[PDB]
Ligand SMILES: [Cl-]
């Protein structure tokens with residue numbers, strides 16, 4: 138989707154707010170920590186999301202005004218809520234009502250439950266991860282060193298093809314292997330893996346600029362064509 | 365600039381809020397009416413802005429979060445403030461202080477002054493307008509029916525070349541004449557007029573989509589190249 | 592406000608209101624503006640201008656074929672002769688809807704609209720949803736206005752990227768036999784002159 | 794809220810806080826989560842992981858040329874052998890700064906960052922200014938961090954558009970003669986492993 142999240146090459150966002158690493162606090166509110174726990178706890182059990190593709194589209198679907206103002210862990214809350222409702226784990230009306238309860242009474246007690254087997258399950262996910270590397274029977278379309286042209290496509294669902302990189306000449310840097318294809322997997326339409334490539338783009342090609350700058354981007358095979 | 369204002373082709377902004385024309389109220393707060401008066405009153409006297417090029421860049425420079433939340437006449441206030449400070453008509457500190465006075469005490473009285481000669485001057489501007497049509501000694505580079513390719517350029521100042529139209533093949537529909545060149549004029553760098561063209565672009569070229577749709581866009585000569 | 596995140600915090604609309612009053616007050620005090628100059632502008636755009644001017648042009652084109660032909664051949668000359676000229680209406684073009692061609696106008700970059708002919712734009716015309724989407728999925732947009740065009744009708748979207756402005760000339764509907772020019776003008780909606788609606792039979 | 798303009802009105806951050814608590818409460822009540830599962834995650838990312846793991850790798854590469862060469866040849870195998878593997882760190886690549894090549898990492902589309910190796914990302918890494926600008930004007934961005942590279946140094950920006958992750962291996966500075974591997978690790982800043990800083994001499 139050509140959304141607010143796809144910011145590469147945009148102007149107007151201002152200076153970067155530099156802070157010394159030792160002063161760069163992780164969390165300033167408890168709900169931020171909770172957001173992190175909700176994401177991993179759900180994903181480790183396949184609740185709402187099996188991996189990060191489903192996670193990302195729920196953030197991308199945020200209202201632009203919310204994306205820019207929620208703060209970062211607000212994105213995480215948004216996507217957990219989106220995905221749990223979309224998959225039928227939670228009912229939207231029940232969730233909205235409970236949200237209103239906590240808004241009006243923020244000190245409302247949270248139910249407590251210990252489940253050490255769930256803790257082990259979560260740990261295992263944190264440690265084992267969710268590699269998207271697969272094997273397919275086809276061979277790669279492209280080879281290292283080949284000059285390709287990226288497509289001019291405009292998916293309305295999820296994609297990992299940033300707008301700034303579309304309809305551009307680049308050079309294949311590496312063939313990684315076949316990876317789960319986000320544009321399908323985010324929508325629960327199958328892993329449908331495709332070859333993933335690293336591609337180098339020169340500043341002159343991306344921007345018309347005159348700098349010894351380049352961008353390396355990972356692109357799935359269907360984002361590109363031969364020349 | 366590749367800013368938040370340049371929305372053509374973006375996803376995620378949602379449904380259009382349809383309203384019957386008879387119910388589509390112009391103004392719901394007095395300050396909105398005032399915004400309109402400030403813009404035209406200043407522009408009619410060349411204060412902060414001589415035409416709309418300077419006007420537009422001041423809006424485009426808004427913080428993204430402000431652009432999306434101020435409401436429409438908030439853009440007008442932003443650009444009047446920007447341009448009057450930038451040109452030295454108003455002092456930023458004085459303006460910020462006075463803003464704080466009205467924020468804390470919104471019923472603070474506004475000074476009254478009648479100037480019927482200024483009214484006549486403003487009227488004349490409303491009636492005569494500010495046509496940007498000029499003549500230049502050069503001939504047009506392009507002709508009706510010619511297939512052109514728009515450039516891949518990324519001005520960091522003002523431009524009227526929308527991102528969605530860049531690096532695209534199109535066909536010249538009309539040669540209007542030479543018009544004041546926004547990318548210079550918005551920055552007070554001279555009228556420097558260039559030939560202006562209307563250019564047709566097909567949906568297949570803009571988006572890869574399969575529709576009997578097209579877009580007509582007006583583009584200055586320096587935005588394009590021959591094929 | 593955490594200084595890492597000032598960009599999360601919009602100005603409240605009360606700030607814009609205060610800033611407007613501050614600008615007004617300073618400019619009047621310094622002799623740059625006057626009360627009556629500000630009021631004159633407001634009167635002009637809120638009351639003197641409006642879509643009834645475009646409606647008159649449309650009804651005249653429907654009733655007078657010679658006028659229609661001149662309008663389409665040289666709209667700027669014709670509109671100026673009628674007095675529909677001024678700020679943001681120095682160069683106005685008319686684009687004709689036909690059975691197989693539907694025209695829709697936008698300003699993707701802002702809000703540009705021919706004030707001397709149509710008055711101030713619609714609320715939605717200035718907002719991101721319409722501006723972003725109409726250039727890419729005009730059929731989906733038009734359906735949100737109740738206009739469901741067949742796949743066989745071509746759509747031309749006109750993006751107002753220069754000071755040239757565009758007004759759509761909609762087709763006269765069925766059911767209007769014997770109506771006078773003045774009666775026909777009453778049928779011409781603002782939305783039909785942007786291209787987001789056809790005109791319904793009476 | 795005027796229903797023409799609901800998109801002008803962001804959710805307050807209090808809404809996100811309330812929504813988080815609502816999700817927690819519902820998921821615990823329905824047996825999907827537990828208090829201890831949520832706490833386990835928080836402990837892991839806030840305390841167990843962090844940039845000290847990348848710093849160890851950098852110091853080992855500086856002190857052991859055989860290790861450096863293996864790391865650059867096959868970083869995924871090497872990092873996994875060290876135990877720096879897990880969620881969002883299944884496929885980690887190391888990119889070496891050299892005298893004429895400077896590497897900088899970003900996730901333009903979101904925030905992707907190799908948690909098992911570096912912990913949670915910087916505040917600024919996730920925000921629009923860095924993400925938008927570093928791919929187009931990296932020299933201007935790096936100057937805001939105090940790194941002013943000559944025009945003759947090439948910059949390679951690595952956009953984390955897939956699940957592959959990248960860690961920058963910065964050069965060992967002058968002034969470090971005789972330091973042990975452990976002492977060198979203390980010099981390796983988080984920011985140097987993203988590419989927004991060189992390491993200062995002690
Ligand atoms: Cl296959």
Ligand SMILES: [Cl-]
Nearest residue numbers: 500501502503
């Ligand atoms: Cl010339």
Ligand SMILES: [Cl-]
Nearest residue numbers: 688761762789
């Ligand atoms: Cl029509």
Ligand SMILES: [Cl-]
Nearest residue numbers: 890963964991
């Ligand atoms: Cl370095």
Ligand SMILES: [Co+3]
Nearest residue numbers: 698701702703
């Ligand atoms: Co406009």
Ligand SMILES: [Co+3]
Nearest residue numbers: 900903904905
């Ligand atoms: Co990311």
